[PDB]
Amino acid sequence: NNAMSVVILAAGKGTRMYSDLPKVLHTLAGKAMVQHVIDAANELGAAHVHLVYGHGGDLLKQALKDDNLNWVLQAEQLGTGHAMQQAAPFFADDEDILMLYGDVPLISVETLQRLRDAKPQGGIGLLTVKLDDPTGYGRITRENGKVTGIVEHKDATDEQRQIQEINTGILIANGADMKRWLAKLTNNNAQGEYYITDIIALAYQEGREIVAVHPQRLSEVEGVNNRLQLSRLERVYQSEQAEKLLLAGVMLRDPARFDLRGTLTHGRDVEIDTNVIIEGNVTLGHRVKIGTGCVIKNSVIGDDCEISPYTVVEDANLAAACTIGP
Amino acid sequence: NNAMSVVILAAGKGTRMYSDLPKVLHTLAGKAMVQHVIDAANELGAAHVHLVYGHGGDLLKQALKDDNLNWVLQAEQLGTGHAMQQAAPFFADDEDILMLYGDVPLISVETLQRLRDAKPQGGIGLLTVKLDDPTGYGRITRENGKVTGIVEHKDATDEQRQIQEINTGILIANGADMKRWLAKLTNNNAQGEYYITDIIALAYQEGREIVAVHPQRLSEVEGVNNRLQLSRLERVYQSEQAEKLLLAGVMLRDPARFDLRGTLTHGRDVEIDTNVIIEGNVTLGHRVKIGTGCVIKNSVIGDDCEISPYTVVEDANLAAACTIGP
Amino acid sequence: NNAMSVVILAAGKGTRMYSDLPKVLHTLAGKAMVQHVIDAANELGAAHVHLVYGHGGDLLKQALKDDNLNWVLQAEQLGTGHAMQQAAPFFADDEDILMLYGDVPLISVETLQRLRDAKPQGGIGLLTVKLDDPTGYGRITRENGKVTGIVEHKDATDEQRQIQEINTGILIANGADMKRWLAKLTNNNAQGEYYITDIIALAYQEGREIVAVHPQRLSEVEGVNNRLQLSRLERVYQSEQAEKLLLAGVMLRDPARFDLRGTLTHGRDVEIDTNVIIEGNVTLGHRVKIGTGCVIKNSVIGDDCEISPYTVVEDANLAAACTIGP
Numbered sequence: 001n002n003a004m005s006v007v008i009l010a011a012g013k014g015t016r017m018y019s020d021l022p023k024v025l026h027t028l029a030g031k032a033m034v035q036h037v038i039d040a041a042n043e044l045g046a047a048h049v050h051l052v053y054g055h056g057g058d059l060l061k062q063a064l065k066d067d068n069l070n071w072v073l074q075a076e077q078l079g080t081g082h083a084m085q086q087a088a089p090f091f092a093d094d095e096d097i098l099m100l101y102g103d104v105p106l107i108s109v110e111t112l113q114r115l116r117d118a119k120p121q122g123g124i125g126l127l128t129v130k131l132d133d134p135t136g137y138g139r140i141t142r143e144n145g146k147v148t149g150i151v152e153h154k155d156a157t158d159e160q161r162q163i164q165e166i167n168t169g170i171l172i173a174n175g176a177d178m179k180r181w182l183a184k185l186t187n188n189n190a191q192g193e194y195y196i197t198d199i200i201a202l203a204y205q206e207g208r209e210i211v212a213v214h215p216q217r218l219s220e221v222e223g224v225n226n227r228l229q230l231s232r233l234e235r236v237y238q239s240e241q242a243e244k245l246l247l248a249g250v251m252l253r254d255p256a257r258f259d260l261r262g263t264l265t266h267g268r269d270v271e272i273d274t275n276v277i278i279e280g281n282v283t284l285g286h287r288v289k290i291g292t293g294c295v296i297k298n299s300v301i302g303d304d305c306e307i308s309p310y311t312v313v314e315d316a317n318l319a320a321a322c323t324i325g326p
Numbered sequence: 327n328n329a330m331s332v333v334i335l336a337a338g339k340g341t342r343m344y345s346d347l348p349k350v351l352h353t354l355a356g357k358a359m360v361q362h363v364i365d366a367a368n369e370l371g372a373a374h375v376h377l378v379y380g381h382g383g384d385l386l387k388q389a390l391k392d393d394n395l396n397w398v399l400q401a402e403q404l405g406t407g408h409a410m411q412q413a414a415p416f417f418a419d420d421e422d423i424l425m426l427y428g429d430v431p432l433i434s435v436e437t438l439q440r441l442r443d444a445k446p447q448g449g450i451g452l453l454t455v456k457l458d459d460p461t462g463y464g465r466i467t468r469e470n471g472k473v474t475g476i477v478e479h480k481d482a483t484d485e486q487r488q489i490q491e492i493n494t495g496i497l498i499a500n501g502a503d504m505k506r507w508l509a510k511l512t513n514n515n516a517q518g519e520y521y522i523t524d525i526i527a528l529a530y531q532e533g534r535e536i537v538a539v540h541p542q543r544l545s546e547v548e549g550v551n552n553r554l555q556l557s558r559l560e561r562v563y564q565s566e567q568a569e570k571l572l573l574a575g576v577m578l579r580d581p582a583r584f585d586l587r588g589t590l591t592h593g594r595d596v597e598i599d600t601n602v603i604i605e606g607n608v609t610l611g612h613r614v615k616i617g618t619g620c621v622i623k624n625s626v627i628g629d630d631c632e633i634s635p636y637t638v639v640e641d642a643n644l645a646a647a648c649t650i651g652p
Numbered sequence: 653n654n655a656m657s658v659v660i661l662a663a664g665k666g667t668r669m670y671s672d673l674p675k676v677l678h679t680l681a682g683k684a685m686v687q688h689v690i691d692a693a694n695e696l697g698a699a700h701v702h703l704v705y706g707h708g709g710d711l712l713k714q715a716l717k718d719d720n721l722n723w724v725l726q727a728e729q730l731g732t733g734h735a736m737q738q739a740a741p742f743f744a745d746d747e748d749i750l751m752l753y754g755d756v757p758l759i760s761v762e763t764l765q766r767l768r769d770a771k772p773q774g775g776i777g778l779l780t781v782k783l784d785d786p787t788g789y790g791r792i793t794r795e796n797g798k799v800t801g802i803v804e805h806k807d808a809t810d811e812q813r814q815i816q817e818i819n820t821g822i823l824i825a826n827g828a829d830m831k832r833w834l835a836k837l838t839n840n841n842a843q844g845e846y847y848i849t850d851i852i853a854l855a856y857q858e859g860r861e862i863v864a865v866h867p868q869r870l871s872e873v874e875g876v877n878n879r880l881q882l883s884r885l886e887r888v889y890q891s892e893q894a895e896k897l898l899l900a901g902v903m904l905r906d907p908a909r910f911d912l913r914g915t916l917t918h919g920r921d922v923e924i925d926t927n928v929i930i931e932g933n934v935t936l937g938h939r940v941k942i943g944t945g946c947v948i949k950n951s952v953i954g955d956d957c958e959i960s961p962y963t964v965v966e967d968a969n970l971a972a973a974c975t976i977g978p
C-alpha cells in the first residue's frame with residue numbers, strides 16, 4: 001500500500017440547486033456531500049486531502065473547518081484537468097494521487113481500495129461503468145482489450161459514441177506521473193477546457209498501462225447536480241443502511257421508512273418501528289423498542305427501554321428498562 | 327386559438343367505489359376528481375363547461391356550487407355518444423368542443439393544448455396511447471397511416487384486437503361538425519349504446535381529417551373506477567409534484583413521503599422533512615424548516631421559521647424567525 | 653374433503669436472525685410467523701397440527717400455549733424427511749397429511765385448498781414454482797409431462813440444474829402412504845440427511861401419481877431466514893392487505909404507508925390517512941376519519957368519529973360522532 005493522497009474536485013457551479021448554499025455542502029443523511037467524500041478519502045488512508053474549490057471558499061472553509069484539508073483554489077472553471085493542474089504542485093512524487101468528485105457522495109472505500117489494488121505500476125487505475133445509455137459521458141477506448149484513452153462525448157464521433165463503457169471520473173496514478181501528464185494537458189477540444197481524461201491517452205502513449213475497475217453499485221458513482229438527484233441518493237443511501245441493519249440483527253418494521261442520519265450503535269434484538277429517524281451519535285442497548293415515528297438524536301438509550309410512538313429523544317442518556325411514554 | 331368549450335362526461339355509476347359519495351367527487355389531493363378536470367378545462371380557456379351527470383345531481387351541484395358549470399342531465403346511461411347528444415344543443419357552431427371524462431383526474435393542460443393545436447380544420451383532434459395490452463379499449467383504425475375510425479373492443483374482430491393504439495376517450499372537434507355527427511349516431515352494436523367513438527368514422531367519411539396526439543405520461547389518461555386505482559393516481563400525482571418542488575429548489579427529505587393537498591408558495595432554501603402534509607393554501611418563506619410529520623394547513627410561515635416534528639400548523643400566519651416547538 | 657392433519661417443520665436453527673428469540677416466533681404483522689402457518693392450517697380444516705421443533709421447546713411452547721398443537725421433537729436436524737419421520741407415528745392412515753414450513757408465513761388457505769383438490773388418490777399433491785434462477789432448490793423431474801421425483805440442487809447434475817420448476821416444500825399425501833414412504837427414506841446423498849423429497853420418486857415407483865399445483869403469488873411460498881427477508885414479506889403482506897381494503901371500500905391515503913397488525917372490522921366510507929397503524933382487534937364504524945399517523949389498538953371507534961393526526965387510540969370504545977383531537 002504505497003502512500004497516497006486524494007484530490008477532490010468541488011469547484012463546479014451548482015446552478016440547478018437554486019440555493020445560496022454551495023452545492024457540495026448540501027447534506028446526504030445530515031452530512032455534507034463533500035464530507036462523505038472526505039470521510040471516504042481519510043478511511044482509505046489519504047495522507048493529504050486537497051479540496052479544489054471555485055468560490056464560497058469562506059462558506060466552505062467555515063463549514064469544513066474541522067478537517068485537515070489543503071485548500072486549492074481553481075480561479076476559473078476550465079475543466080477537470082485544469083482543476084487538477086492547480087492541485088499538482090502539492091502531489092508528492094512518492095505517493096499515489098487518487099482523484100474524486102465532491103458531488104459523488106456514495107463512493108465506497110471498498111471500491112476505492114479495489115481501484116488502488118488494480119493500479120499497475122507507473123500506470124493508471126481507472127473506475128468505469130457500462131451504461132445502457134452512455135450519452136454525455138467520457139467513452140472508454142480500448143485496443144485489443146486494453147484501455148488506450150477516454151474520449152469526451154462531445155469530442156467522440158457517432159461510431160465512438162456507441163461505446164457503452166464510460167468514465168466515472170475517479171482515477172488513481174503516481175503523483176510524479178500525474179504532474180508530468182498534467183503539465184502536457186492541452187485545451188483545444190469540443191469545449192476548450194483542460195480534460196483530466198486526456199491523461200489516459202498520454203499514459204498509454206508513454207507505454208504505461210491503464211486498468212479499469214468497476215464500482216459495486218452504480219449509485220456509488222452518481223453525481224448530484226440538483227435536489228431531485230440528491231433525494232434519490234438519500235434514498236439509496238438510507239435503504240442500503242436499513243438493509244445492513246436488518247441483516248445485522250436490528251428489526252426495522254419497514255426499511256423504506258427508516259432514516260439514519262449519523263451513527264448508530266446497537267445491541268441485540270433492538271426493534272425500530274416505522275418512520276423513525278436516528279440523528280447524530282445514537283446508541284441503542286439490547287432489546288430497546290423504538291415506537292413509530294420517534295426521532296432519536298445524540299442519545300444513549302439503555303437496554304430494555306421502550307420508547308412510545310412519536311417521542312423525540314434528544315441529548316439524553318436514558319437509564320436501562322425505561323418506559324418513555326404513556 | 328378558436329373559442330372553445332368543454333364537455334365532461336361524469337354520468338357513469340361508480341359501483342366499485344362502494345360509497346354513498348358520487349365517484350367523481352372523491353378527492354385526489356383534497357380536490358374532487360371532477361374539480362381537477364374542471365380546473366384543467368378552465369385553465370385551458372374553456373368558455374363553458376358542460377358537466378354531464380346521471381344522478382346525485384344534488385350532491386354534485388352542492389359540492390360544485392362555486393363553479394360556473396352548465397348542468398346536462400343524462401337520464402339513462404346509454405353510452406358516451408348518448409351522453410354527448412344531451413350536451414350537443416349547448417355547443418356553439420363557432421367553437422371547438424373538447425370532451426373529457428370526470429374520472430380521469432390527471433389530464434394536463436399541456437397535453438390538452440397540444441391536442442387543440444393538432445386538431446385540423448373541420449377535423450378531429452384525438453388523444454390516443456399505444457398500450458402493451460389494449461384489451462377493453464377502443465382500437466384506433468388507420469389506412470395508409472391515417473386515422474379512419476375507432477372500433478370498440480367488444481365490436482372488434484380478433485384481427486383488429488391486435489391493434490395496440492387505443493382511444494383515451496379525449497377528443498376535440500368543431501361544435502357544428504360535432505352536432506352533425508352526434509345526430510347521426512346509431513345504437514346497434516355489441517353493446518346497444520350510442521358510441522361517441524363512431525364520430526371518427528363519420529368524420530373520415532365526410533372527407534375530414536382525424537389527427538391523433540399522445541399524452542406525455544400514461545397516468546395522465548388513467549380513469550378511476552375503484553379506490554385502489556384512485557390511490558395509485560394520488561401517488562403518481564404526489565410524486566410528480568414532489569419532483570417539481572425538488573427541481574424548483576425545495577429540499578424534500580423523501581419525495582415519496584410528501585403530500586401536497588392544495589397550493590404551496592415557497593421561498594428559497596426551504597427544507598421539508600419526511601411525512602409532511604401540505605393542505606389548502608400554504609406559504610413557506612425563505613429558509614423555513616419543516617420537521618418530520620408536520621401538517622401545515624392554510625397557513626403562512628414567515629422566513630427562517632423552524633417547525634418542530636409533528637406540529638400541526640393550521641389557520642395561522644407565523645411571524646418570521648419563529649421557533650415552533652421544543 | 654377427506655379428513656386431514658398438518659405437520660409444520662419449524663426445527664431449523666435460524667442462525668442469520670442473530671436473536672435470542674426462536675426464528676419462527678418473530679412476528680409478521682404482530683403475529684409470529686409460525687402462528688400464521690398454524691392459523692392457515694386450522695382455517696383449512698386441519699384436525700391436528702403437529703409442530704416439529706428442535707430446541708426452545710420452552711420458549712415455543714410458552715408462546716404458542718393457546719394452540720392445540722401436538723409437539724414433535726426433532727432431536728437433531730437431519731433433514732426434512734427425518735423431521736417428518738418423527739411426526740409419522742402420529743399421522744392417521746385415514747387422513748391426508750399436509751406438510752408446511754414454520755418459516756413460510758404467507759402460504760394462503762386458497763392455495764392449500766387447491767393443493768388438496770389436486771392430490772390424486774394414493775398420490776401426492778405437490779406445490780411447485782418455476783423460477784428464473786432455481787439455484788439451491790429441489791428440481792422437479794418429469795417424464796412425458798409427469799412428475800417422477802425431486803432432485804436436490806446439490807444432488808442434481810449440470811443438466812438437471814437447468815430445470816426451472818422447483819419444490820416449494822409444501823406437499824400433501826395420505827398418511828398411510830406417508831408412513832410407508834417415510835419408513836423407506838435413506839440418508840446417503842449430497843448432504844447425508846433424510847430428504848422428505850425422496851418420497852416423490854418413491855410414490856412414482858409404487859405407480860402412484862404426483863400432481864404439481866402452483867401458488868397464486870411467489871411471496872406466498874417465501875421462507876424467512878433473516879430479518880431482511882422478513883421485512884420484505886411484512887411489506888408484501890401489508891401491501892396485499894391495503895389493496896384488499898381499498899378494493900373493499902376503505903380509502904387509504906397511501907396503501908404503502910399503512911400497517912394492519914391484527915384484525916380490522918370497518919364500516920362504509922372510512923378514511924385512513926398515511927402512516928396509520930392498526931393493532932389487535934380494531935373496529936371502525938361508518939365514515940370514521942383517521943388522521944395521519946394514528947395508532948389504533950384494540951379499540952372500537954363509533955360511526956362518524958374523527959381522530960386527529962398522531963393520536964394513539966388504545967383499549968378504548970369511542971362513542972359515535974366523537975372528535976378526538978384539537
Ligand SMILES: CC(=O)N[C@H]1[C@@H](OP(=O)(O)OP(=O)(O)OC[C@H]2O[C@@H](n3ccc(=O)[nH]c3=O)[C@H](O)[C@@H]2O)O[C@H](CO)[C@@H](O)[C@@H]1O
Pocket residue numbers: 009010011012013052074076077078079080081082083101102103136137138139150152166167168169194195196197223
Ligand atoms: C473532461 C472530463 O473530466 N470528463 C469527465 C467529467 O466530465 P464533466 O466535465 O462533464 O463533469 P462535470 O462538469 O460534472 O465535472 C465533474 C466534477 O469536476 C468538478 N469540476 C468541473 C470543472 C471544473 O472546472 N472544476 C471542477 O472542479 C465538478 O465540480 C464535479 O465535481 O465527468 C464525467 C462523470 O460525471 C465523465 O464521464 C467525463 O468523462
Ligand SMILES: CC(=O)N[C@H]1[C@@H](OP(=O)(O)OP(=O)(O)OC[C@H]2O[C@@H](n3ccc(=O)[nH]c3=O)[C@H](O)[C@@H]2O)O[C@H](CO)[C@@H](O)[C@@H]1O
Pocket residue numbers: 335336337338339378400402403404405406407408409427428429462463464465476478492493494495520521522523549
Ligand atoms: C364508446 C366509447 O366511448 N368507448 C371508449 C370509452 O369506453 P367505455 O364506454 O367503456 O368507458 P366508460 O364506461 O368507463 O365511460 C367513460 C366515461 O364516460 C362516462 N359515461 C359512460 C357511459 C354513459 O352513459 N355516460 C357517461 O357519462 C363515464 O362516467 C366515464 O367518465 O372509454 C375508453 C377509455 O376509458 C375508450 O378506450 C373507449 O374507446
Ligand SMILES: CC(=O)N[C@H]1[C@@H](OP(=O)(O)OP(=O)(O)OC[C@H]2O[C@@H](n3ccc(=O)[nH]c3=O)[C@H](O)[C@@H]2O)O[C@H](CO)[C@@H](O)[C@@H]1O
Pocket residue numbers: 661662663664665704726728729730731732733734735753754755788789790791802804818819820821846847848849875
Ligand atoms: C430435502 C428437502 O426437503 N429439500 C427442499 C427443502 O430444502 P432445504 O432442506 O434446503 O430447506 P431448509 O433447510 O430451509 O428447510 C426447510 C424447512 O424445514 C425445516 N427443517 C429443515 C431441516 C431439519 O432437520 N428440520 C427442519 O425442521 C426448516 O426449519 C424449514 O422450515 O426446502 C426447499 C424450499 O425452501 C425445497 O426447494 C427443497 O427441495
